[PDB]
Amino acid sequence: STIEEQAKTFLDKFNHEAEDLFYQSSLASWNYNTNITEENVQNMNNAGDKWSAFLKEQSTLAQMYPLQEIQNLTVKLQLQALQQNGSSVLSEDKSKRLNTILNTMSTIYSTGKVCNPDNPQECLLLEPGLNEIMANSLDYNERLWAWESWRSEVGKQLRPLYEEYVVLKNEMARANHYEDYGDYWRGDYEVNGVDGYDYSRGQLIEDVEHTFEEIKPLYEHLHAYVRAKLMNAYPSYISPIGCLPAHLLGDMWGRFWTNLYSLTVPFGQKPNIDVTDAMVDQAWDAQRIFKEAEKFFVSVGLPNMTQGFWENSMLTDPGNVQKAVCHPTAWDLGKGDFRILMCTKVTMDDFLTAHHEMGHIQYDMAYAAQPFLLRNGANEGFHEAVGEIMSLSAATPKHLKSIGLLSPDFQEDNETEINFLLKQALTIVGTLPFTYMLEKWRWMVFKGEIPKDQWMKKWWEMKREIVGVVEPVPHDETYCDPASLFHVSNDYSFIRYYTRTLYQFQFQEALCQAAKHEGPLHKCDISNSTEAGQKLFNMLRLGKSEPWTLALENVVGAKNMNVRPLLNYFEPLFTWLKDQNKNSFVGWSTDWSPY
Amino acid sequence: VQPTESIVRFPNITNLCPFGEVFNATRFASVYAWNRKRISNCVADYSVLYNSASFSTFKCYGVSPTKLNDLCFTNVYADSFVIRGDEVRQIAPGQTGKIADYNYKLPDDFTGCVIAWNSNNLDSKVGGNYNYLYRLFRKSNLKPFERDISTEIYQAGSTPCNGVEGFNCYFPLQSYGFQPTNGVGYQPYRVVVLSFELLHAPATVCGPKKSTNLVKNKCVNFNFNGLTGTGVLTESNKKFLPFQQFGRDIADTTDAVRDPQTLEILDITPCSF
Amino acid sequence: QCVNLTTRTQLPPAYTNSFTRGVYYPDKVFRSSVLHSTQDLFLPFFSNVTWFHAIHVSGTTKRFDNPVLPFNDGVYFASTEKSNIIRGWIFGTTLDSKTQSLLIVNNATNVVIKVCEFQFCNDPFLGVYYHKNNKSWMESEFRVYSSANNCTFEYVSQPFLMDLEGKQGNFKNLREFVFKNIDGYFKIYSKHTPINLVRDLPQGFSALEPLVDLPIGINITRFQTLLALHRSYLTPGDSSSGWTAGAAAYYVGYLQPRTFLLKYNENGTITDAVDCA
Ligand SMILES: *[C@@H]1O[C@H](CO)[C@@H](O[C@@H]2O[C@H](CO)[C@@H](O[C@@H]3O[C@H](CO)[C@@H](O)[C@H](O)[C@@H]3O)[C@H](O)[C@H]2NC(C)=O)[C@H](O)[C@H]1NC(C)=O
Ligand SMILES: *[C@@H]1O[C@H](CO)[C@@H](O[C@@H]2O[C@H](CO)[C@@H](O)[C@H](O)[C@H]2NC(C)=O)[C@H](O)[C@H]1NC(C)=O
Ligand SMILES: *[C@@H]1O[C@H](CO)[C@@H](O[C@@H]2O[C@H](CO)[C@@H](O)[C@H](O)[C@H]2NC(C)=O)[C@H](O)[C@H]1NC(C)=O
Ligand SMILES: *[C@@H]1O[C@H](CO)[C@@H](O[C@@H]2O[C@H](CO)[C@@H](O)[C@H](O)[C@H]2NC(C)=O)[C@H](O)[C@H]1NC(C)=O
Ligand SMILES: *[C@@H]1O[C@H](CO)[C@@H](O[C@@H]2O[C@H](CO)[C@@H](O)[C@H](O)[C@H]2NC(C)=O)[C@H](O)[C@H]1NC(C)=O
Ligand SMILES: *[C@@H]1O[C@H](CO)[C@@H](O[C@@H]2O[C@H](CO)[C@@H](O)[C@H](O)[C@H]2NC(C)=O)[C@H](O)[C@H]1NC(C)=O
Ligand SMILES: *[C@@H]1O[C@H](CO)[C@@H](O[C@@H]2O[C@H](CO)[C@@H](O)[C@H](O)[C@H]2NC(C)=O)[C@H](O)[C@H]1NC(C)=O
Ligand SMILES: *[C@@H]1O[C@H](CO)[C@@H](O[C@@H]2O[C@H](CO)[C@@H](O)[C@H](O)[C@H]2NC(C)=O)[C@H](O)[C@H]1NC(C)=O
Ligand SMILES: *[C@@H]1O[C@H](CO)[C@@H](O)[C@H](O)[C@H]1NC(C)=O
Numbered sequence A: 001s002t003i004e005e006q007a008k009t010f011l012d013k014f015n016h017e018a019e020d021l022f023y024q025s026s027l028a029s030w031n032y033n034t035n036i037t038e039e040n041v042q043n044m045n046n047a048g049d050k051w052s053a054f055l056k057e058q059s060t061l062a063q064m065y066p067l068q069e070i071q072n073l074t075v076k077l078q079l080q081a082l083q084q085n086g087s088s089v090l091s092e093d094k095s096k097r098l099n100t101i102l103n104t105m106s107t108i109y110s111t112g113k114v115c116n117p118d119n120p121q122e123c124l125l126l127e128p129g130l131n132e133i134m135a136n137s138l139d140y141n142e143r144l145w146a147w148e149s150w151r152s153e154v155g156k157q158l159r160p161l162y163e164e165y166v167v168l169k170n171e172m173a174r175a176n177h178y179e180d181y182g183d184y185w186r187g188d189y190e191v192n193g194v195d196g197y198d199y200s201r202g203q204l205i206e207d208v209e210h211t212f213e214e215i216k217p218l219y220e221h222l223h224a225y226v227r228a229k230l231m232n233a234y235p236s237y238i239s240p241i242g243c244l245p246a247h248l249l250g251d252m253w254g255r256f257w258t259n260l261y262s263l264t265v266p267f268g269q270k271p272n273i274d275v276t277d278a279m280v281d282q283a284w285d286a287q288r289i290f291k292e293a294e295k296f297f298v299s300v301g302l303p304n305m306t307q308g309f310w311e312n313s314m315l316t317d318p319g320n321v322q323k324a325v326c327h328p329t330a331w332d333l334g335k336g337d338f339r340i341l342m343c344t345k346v347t348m349d350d351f352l353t354a355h356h357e358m359g360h361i362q363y364d365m366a367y368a369a370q371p372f373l374l375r376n377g378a379n380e381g382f383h384e385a386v387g388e389i390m391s392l393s394a395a396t397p398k399h400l401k402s403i404g405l406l407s408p409d410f411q412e413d414n415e416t417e418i419n420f421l422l423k424q425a426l427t428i429v430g431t432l433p434f435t436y437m438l439e440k441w442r443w444m445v446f447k448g449e450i451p452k453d454q455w456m457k458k459w460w461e462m463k464r465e466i467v468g469v470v471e472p473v474p475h476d477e478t479y480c481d482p483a484s485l486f487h488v489s490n491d492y493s494f495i496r497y498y499t500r501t502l503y504q505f506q507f508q509e510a511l512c513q514a515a516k517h518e519g520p521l522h523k524c525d526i527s528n529s530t531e532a533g534q535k536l537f538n539m540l541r542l543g544k545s546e547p548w549t550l551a552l553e554n555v556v557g558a559k560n561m562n563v564r565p566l567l568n569y570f571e572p573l574f575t576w577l578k579d580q581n582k583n584s585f586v587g588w589s590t591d592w593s594p595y
Numbered sequence B: 001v002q003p004t005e006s007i008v009r010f011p012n013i014t015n016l017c018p019f020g021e022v023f024n025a026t027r028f029a030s031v032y033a034w035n036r037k038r039i040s041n042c043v044a045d046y047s048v049l050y051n052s053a054s055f056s057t058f059k060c061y062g063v064s065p066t067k068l069n070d071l072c073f074t075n076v077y078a079d080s081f082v083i084r085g086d087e088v089r090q091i092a093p094g095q096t097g098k099i100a101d102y103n104y105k106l107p108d109d110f111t112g113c114v115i116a117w118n119s120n121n122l123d124s125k126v127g128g129n130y131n132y133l134y135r136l137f138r139k140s141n142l143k144p145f146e147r148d149i150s151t152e153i154y155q156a157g158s159t160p161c162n163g164v165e166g167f168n169c170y171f172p173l174q175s176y177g178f179q180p181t182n183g184v185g186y187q188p189y190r191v192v193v194l195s196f197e198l199l200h201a202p203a204t205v206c207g208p209k210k211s212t213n214l215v216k217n218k219c220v221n222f223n224f225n226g227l228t229g230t231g232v233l234t235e236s237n238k239k240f241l242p243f244q245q246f247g248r249d250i251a252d253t254t255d256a257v258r259d260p261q262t263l264e265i266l267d268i269t270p271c272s273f
Numbered sequence C: 001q002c003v004n005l006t007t008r009t010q011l012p013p014a015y016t017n018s019f020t021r022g023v024y025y026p027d028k029v030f031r032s033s034v035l036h037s038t039q040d041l042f043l044p045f046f047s048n049v050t051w052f053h054a055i056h057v058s059g060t061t062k063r064f065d066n067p068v069l070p071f072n073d074g075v076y077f078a079s080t081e082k083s084n085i086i087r088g089w090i091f092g093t094t095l096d097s098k099t100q101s102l103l104i105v106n107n108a109t110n111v112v113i114k115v116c117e118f119q120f121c122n123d124p125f126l127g128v129y130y131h132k133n134n135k136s137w138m139e140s141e142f143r144v145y146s147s148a149n150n151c152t153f154e155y156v157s158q159p160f161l162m163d164l165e166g167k168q169g170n171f172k173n174l175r176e177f178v179f180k181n182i183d184g185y186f187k188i189y190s191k192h193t194p195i196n197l198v199r200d201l202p203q204g205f206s207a208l209e210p211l212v213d214l215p216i217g218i219n220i221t222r223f224q225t226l227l228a229l230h231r232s233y234l235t236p237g238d239s240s241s242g243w244t245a246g247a248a249a250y251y252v253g254y255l256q257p258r259t260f261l262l263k264y265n266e267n268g269t270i271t272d273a274v275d276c277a
């Protein structure tokens, strides 16, 4: 008779219907991804349209239940997740205009070509040409030309589209009882109704700023080292005092510094740990790789893989007659079916990727024991963190020599340790200031602190102050440089990467302390540690039913994210960089420019 | 003074209980409309059910599985239906949930065995097998051994439902989604429940009484129907009536008995001392 | 479905002094050339036995007596037939749908033995049709029970076809039955002796042998006899009239606990008996 009982009955009906409907939709999507044709795409589109109409109807039905009269936290969270009427509060014309803007921006980013000024008969595309030029080329002029062409041919076209997109998103957020679209994005970290575990929206910004201030010295030392190393490859292009140029970071936008490992390698006389040859001489296969991953997971203390996972997943390329997308993804069908779509080749990188995907599958199977609306990670960065901690624990030389890939007589030299730590730094800590600056710029452009005639001005000011990146040539208000990224031109959040980067190292330190392991943190292996397995399963089981702060306290012992585990992970590298930067000038000055 | 052998004779085991009719049934019923077949006036060989690895769960409540063939009952009820894999343990005395409260509930003093096996090879088809249904909503819990085939719209609120679905008006029966790609837990599991009932009526269903081989010209204790004696069994020259089982001498002592399998008369002589 | 029967003039019930008949085998023990004393439910050698007539006169009493008779401790049912008029019996307590009852009937093809809580009628009977077209009877209109529900026991025999024609002459068949209900078991005794009489069955001795032992935990208080009726073109009547009953008569004697001295011969068959009363 009460409203809570009616809400529980409606939630039961929804968990009954939406489960089967989403299972059919996921089956259609799996049949399309593993088999590209004209019928599978139509079936997937029909299933997706039916699922979207069902979600819209269920949301319009659930909006008739007040949220203030519900006293159960689970029912309240399910209703709050179901009553999310985001793209329906605006008018029909405004919604159609926003969808058209999103589609045209996605097409401009995807179908974006640039032709050479001397060869108009052959143009360059992003993925095959521009990434290759920005990654494997060393010529200053060629990289500068590619960067300017990408920022001009595509950046200038997305200026009015983004100017209208920000206004439409702000209107949608204000219609949903939010301050701005940045507030709507930060709402994913908001938890209420629990004493002591509450987390507001501005507290997220405060914690991110505090963690960045605490991590700034390590990034400054790494930037000084990278600058000193790049001064050799470019003698008269980079100054020892100023910031690094934008087109000399090994990436189209400077997000990941992984491609700079060949130039900033500490000791080039000792090769990196590569067990690909030892994997191909022992007659390994994708089946063997996934079997070894399952053995690792069952030694940690997690259950085995389901029989359907072995008799239904496509762990290898089907061939040339059948086309499939070779992007490693973990599939959660919903009705106890878990699969992995990956064109696994015999490589160490594919080994770590398989461990990551199996960690995703383990998280899915762990939270599968909860209602449909709660079958998700506690936050938008928990899944990737749980995958990356396994990928890191599987890449240790101890685990490799215990499996059989690495020779038991292989000695652990500190030079290889420094090289591995530097690679991990370039691939992890290099994107933290970039992520922070991008997310802060998006937050300040959604809130309204940046006028429309100062977007790229303040963007470059922040990228030169926060990050050590300076623009080569002056870009006026028509070169919408920020919108040249995939996540910003496709309406995707970006702080999730920073949060998952913190969470992975927090989880790693917690599971290493629970494993009774001594020494450095980067050499820690949790293969035969059932205590760490149970401590992690206590967090993977909660899923989305409990706040992410409670999950953190269950897995690491603290209700707030901390950057100290990340600094402890790079402590030997920190000492080595401080030793190698005695004569170099640590830091950067914003007055220098390549003009 | 030394009876070495121990012979046990009994009539042939005929008229077996139709267990293969309820176990190997082609079409099973839903959990809300479970069939209740009555088993009586037959010998129930429970050894073929226990000695079969096809059944996943063979839990017996209030009775031992080995001693099933050594007990008699008046009638046995076989409740057969299809249930989901993750809710098989709800079919047990003292369990709650959606099936144990709205579809099928066992009493706390239930005396019987629950048998279930995976049926993904039969009850699952590509595209979804929506032939099986289960009651999701009900105004109150079910009594032990109670059916509910009502199709009335469940009124979840104060607004009267005019026999149509809508806000706070949901249909009570919901269909299962049985796809062949579902993992363990969501796959269809055919489960049968054998309820043992003992009343004041004579026991009709018993266990198959085992029979041993005969032996002649040896001092052996015997048991044909209820005669527990000890002597030497030899072939006789008399003829009993077609209905008389055993006989006795003038001294009111067991003299002969007809074999329940060969219908032959065997003389009984006490082993001398 | 049930149809009552009219044009049945009531006559005072007759009684016939039974002879030494009624002795059966109380146990399955073999005895030879000995006199054993038993104390069980038996029938006295001389007692009042109710005589029920089933005849059809040519004009100026049509009797089709099949009333509901009590069942105190056991009944001795003797059938003097010439064309198999008696089809079976209906045992029970109230013959209603609230309590279970015993249905034993032979419909010329199978021996139906069902124990269910039927809904019987006042005049349950079977019928035959003297069809002159194919010179065959092919009995039909099985009017015994209307509503059958909650059956706990059922037994049918192999298909057969007994003689359904109406013989003319004397009673050339004698079927004796003794029904007992002790310890929840319904014991039935039977004995067939070819005789040739018109009425008041002759004196003799026939030891009734155990036929079946039906385990049914039901209370038996009253029972009714299932007879048959003949119908042809020369029968004035539409629904209740238009039938004739063949020459038949059955006897019912109640058992009483007494002591009997059974005399066995060299083959284990009871030859004589002595009643101590
Ligand atoms: C219980 O079952 C056993 C086994 O079936 C019966 O033993 C055998 O029964 C048959 C049939 O009465 C006896 O006759 C034999 O028949 C076969 C097949 O027609 C024939 O090939 C033989 O030459 C013989 O005539 C047989 O002697 C008997 N014993 C053996 C060792 O086969 C037994 O009769 C059954 N008892 C009851 C009470 O049903
Ligand atoms: C909110 O409702 C759920 C029911 O969906 C409650 O969960 C029950 O919790 C008790 C005790 O922990 C269990 O015995 C039940 O089996 C649970 N019901 C389930 C799983 O369906 C939950 O406790 C409620 N929240 C609060 C704060 O009371
Ligand atoms: C975890 O435990 C397993 C099982 O005890 C270890 O595997 C054994 O390792 C020893 C040491 O080399 C070998 O001699 C055995 O043959 C291994 N067992 C098998 C079945 O091959 C394993 O080394 C432990 N550590 C890790 C990191 O897995
Ligand atoms: C249902 O059918 C199966 C299939 O025949 C029966 O399993 C057989 O059981 C007998 C018993 O000894 C075995 O000899 C057969 O080998 C079994 N069949 C197979 C294919 O292995 C099962 O017994 C039947 N159910 C019941 C209750 O009788
Ligand atoms: C047959 O006659 C009887 C009495 O003349 C009719 O009444 C039935 O009587 C019996 C016992 O006296 C009751 O159990 C029934 O309930 C009575 N029936 C009714 C309708 O009252 C009986 O109806 C007649 N049969 C037919 C078919 O008409
Ligand atoms: C049945 O027993 C009685 C007991 O005396 C006898 O028949 C009775 O005879 C008198 C004399 O006219 C009648 O008034 C009674 O109505 C009769 N009773 C019965 C039950 O018939 C006789 O001993 C027995 N009957 C016969 C035919 O021998
Ligand atoms: C005599 O009665 C028996 C049992 O009531 C009848 O046998 C059944 O008849 C029905 C209807 O014809 C069939 O559906 C069943 O399959 C029969 N069962 C058996 C075991 O035979 C029989 O038909 C009746 N005969 C007559 C002439 O009425
Ligand atoms: C004799 O032949 C007749 C001719 O049809 C049959 O008896 C009838 O059969 C029809 C067909 O079902 C039905 O009206 C009845 O079953 C019978 N009616 C009558 C009035 O008898 C049948 O083949 C034979 N009947 C007999 C009694 O021998
Ligand atoms: C892929 O789809 C095509 C088109 O229907 C079909 O012919 C083919 O069998 C499919 N491949 C597999 C492996 O099912």
Ligand SMILES: *[C@@H]1O[C@H](CO)[C@@H](O)[C@H](O)[C@H]1NC(C)=O
Pocket (backbone or CB within 6 Å): A063, A083, A084, A085, A088, A089
């Ligand atoms: C959208 O949802 C909010 C609360 O979740 C509600 O106040 C608002 O009315 C909804 N929009 C429409 C158009 O009903």
Ligand SMILES: *[C@@H]1O[C@H](CO)[C@@H](O)[C@H](O)[C@H]1NC(C)=O
Pocket (backbone or CB within 6 Å): A298, A302, A303, A304
């Ligand atoms: C996983 O499988 C192995 C062998 O396949 C078995 O020994 C182990 O017990 C399993 N672990 C489970 C079922 O949790």
Ligand SMILES: *[C@@H]1O[C@H](CO)[C@@H](O)[C@H](O)[C@H]1NC(C)=O
Pocket (backbone or CB within 6 Å): A414, A415, A418, A576
């Ligand atoms: C590595 O270890 C050797 C031997 O202990 C030492 O000489 C060398 O300085 C170390 N290098 C670093 C970078 O720690």
Ligand SMILES: *[C@@H]1O[C@H](CO)[C@@H](O)[C@H](O)[C@H]1NC(C)=O
Pocket (backbone or CB within 6 Å): C100, C150
């Ligand atoms: C059938 O009759 C028996 C007699 O005791 C009773 O126990 C049983 O419940 C009845 N079954 C019904 C009415 O369905």
Ligand SMILES: *[C@@H]1O[C@H](CO)[C@@H](O)[C@H](O)[C@H]1NC(C)=O
Pocket (backbone or CB within 6 Å): C099, C217, C218, C219
């Ligand atoms: C039979 O009668 C006895 C006592 O007269 C009673 O206890 C029992 O319940 C009765 N059984 C039936 C089925 O009526």
Ligand SMILES: *[C@@H]1O[C@H](CO)[C@@H](O)[C@H](O)[C@H]1NC(C)=O
Pocket (backbone or CB within 6 Å): C265, C266, C267, C269
């Ligand atoms: C008894 O049996 C013998 C054969 O065993 C037979 O000759 C005799 O006629 C029988 N007597 C009776 C009275 O049945």
